[PDB]
């Protein structure tokens, strides 16, 4: 009746406008702003190019042939569209695992992944993803032809169908695709996003807190007191000796860097300084009693103070140290907000105090909460992508094993909506990008 074609036109016209406005927008904002072109966004640019390739070059040749019940277009485009329809899904699935491998190496093992987060590596894997996708999907332009059929009163009409030599070669192809495009990309992404969620659940630690409160400066730089410090708050010497700062530095490390310590050299010295700060608390008869009775969040704050001030300096906070042992947290915060350490470094002192008062990492839960926001978005686009393309790949396997029953039950309206679900996947990714930053303000 008239209702099925009418809803097919307004649905396809809307998803065409949505996928052509967003994907054109995201390729612009990335090609305009070099600040946005991170390693993760480079893959998302490739993912957005394939979604536009599938919407512009393929989505029309799927609706208007169905609405006409005839493939009026030539036989060379039946081979071209099916070629691009297959290449688009292959690069999109395998770019979605590239970001999962990228986020795994950047979070779970940030030490041995330096060969991955380089921009030249991402360019050669999106080149390999696009190149091999065109090579893997070569059977589609080869075994796609026009199948003649009669409609009404000897009305000759053609249809574009994918036909292989035998049924064995047909069911071994759709099994190969379900295996290489959904099953294998599925388990490697659950172990990737699962291991990532394990690290992000570990929360903020003391080494990340001190790395935030101090930062990394490779050259010898003046601290708040004026003395030369290097690395992550490693004091060289309090005596005004510019030569002793170079000698004491080269005495610890294994060469005369003349103030040019590598990034891995500063981490070895930063790990040693924390051990010297926690063992200074254990030997102190005033800091050890309060350290053993504090929470893991509050214990890290006490070591943060020893890292900055020293064992003898913080041990003089006898009024605040007893207040911490008295578990009266809000009162210890007011007593600590009146010291010299709070006025010498107000920003650093406010963070360490709020961890004492609340016992939470909320003062440093910023970059961790931003990393949690990106992973939650990447998990949604993967679930939405699989939810859209599973009905068509599973129905193609049913058609390869039982062609009579599969075509009989779903060939009119059911397959018309199954394909419509697979085409919505091209526009849902730009919609999620918007809904992340203040798009929820609109109404």
């Amino acid at each position: 009746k008239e209702w099925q074609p009418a809803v097919q036109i307004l649905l396809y016209s809307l998803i065409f406008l949505l996928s052509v406005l967003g994907n054109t927008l995201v390729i612009t904002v990335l090609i305009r702003n070099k600040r946005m072109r991170t390693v993760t966004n480079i893959f998302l640019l490739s993912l957005a190019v394939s979604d536009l390739m599938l919407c512009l070059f393929c989505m029309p040749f799927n609706l208007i042939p169905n609405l006409l019940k005839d493939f009026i277009f030539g036989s060379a485009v039946c081979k071209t569209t099916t070629y691009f329809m297959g290449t688009s899904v292959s690069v999109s699935t395998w770019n979605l695992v590239a970001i999962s491998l990228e986020r795994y190496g950047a979070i779970c093992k940030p030490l041995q992944s330096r060969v991955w987060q380089t921009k030249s590596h991402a360019l050669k894997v999106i080149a390999a993803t696009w190149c091999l996708s065109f090579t893997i999907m070569t059977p589609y332009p080869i075994y796609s032809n026009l199948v003649p059929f009669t409609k009404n009163n000897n009305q000759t009409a053609n249809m574009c169908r994918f036909l292989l030599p035998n049924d064995v070669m047909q069911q071994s192809w759709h099994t190969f695709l379900l295996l290489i495009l959904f099953l294998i990309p599925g388990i490697v992404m659950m172990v990737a996003y699962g291991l990532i969620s394990l690290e992000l659940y570990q929360g903020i630690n003391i080494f990340e807190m001190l790395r935030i409160d101090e930062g990394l400066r490779l050259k010898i730089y003046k601290d708040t007191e004026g003395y030369y410090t290097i690395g992550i708050g490693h004091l060289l010497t309090k005596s005004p000796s510019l030569n002793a700062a170079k000698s004491e530095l080269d005495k610890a490390i294994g060469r005369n860097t003349n103030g040019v310590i590598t990034k891995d050299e500063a981490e070895k010295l930063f790990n040693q300084d924390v051990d010297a700060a926690v063992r200074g608390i254990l030997r102190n008869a005033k800091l050890k009693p309060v350290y053993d009775s504090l929470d893991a969040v509050r214990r890290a704050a006490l070591i943060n103070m020893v890292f900055q001030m020293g064992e003898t300096g913080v041990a003089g906070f006898t009024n605040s140290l007893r207040m911490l042992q008295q578990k009266r947290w809000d009162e210890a915060a007011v007593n600590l907000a009146k010291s010299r350490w709070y006025n010498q470094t107000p920003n650093r002192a406010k963070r360490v105090i709020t961890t004492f008062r609340t016992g939470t990492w909320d003062a440093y839960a910023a970059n961790l909460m931003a990393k949690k926001r990106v992973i939650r978005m990447l998990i949604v686009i993967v679930v939405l992508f699989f939810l859209c393309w599973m009905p068509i790949f599973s129905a193609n396997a049913w058609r390869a094993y039982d062609t009579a029953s599969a075509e009989r039950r779903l060939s009119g309206t059911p397959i018309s909506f199954i394909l419509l679900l697979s085409y919505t996947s091209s526009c849902v990714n730009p919609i999620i990008y918007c809904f992340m930053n203040k798009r929820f303000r609109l109404g």
């Binding site: 393929c58 569209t81 329809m85 297959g86 574009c160 009119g412």
Partner: peptide, 8 residues
């Protein structure tokens, strides 16, 4: 009687 469907 369109029966079946275009590949993808």
């Amino acid at each position: 009687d369109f029966l079946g469907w275009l590949x993808f």
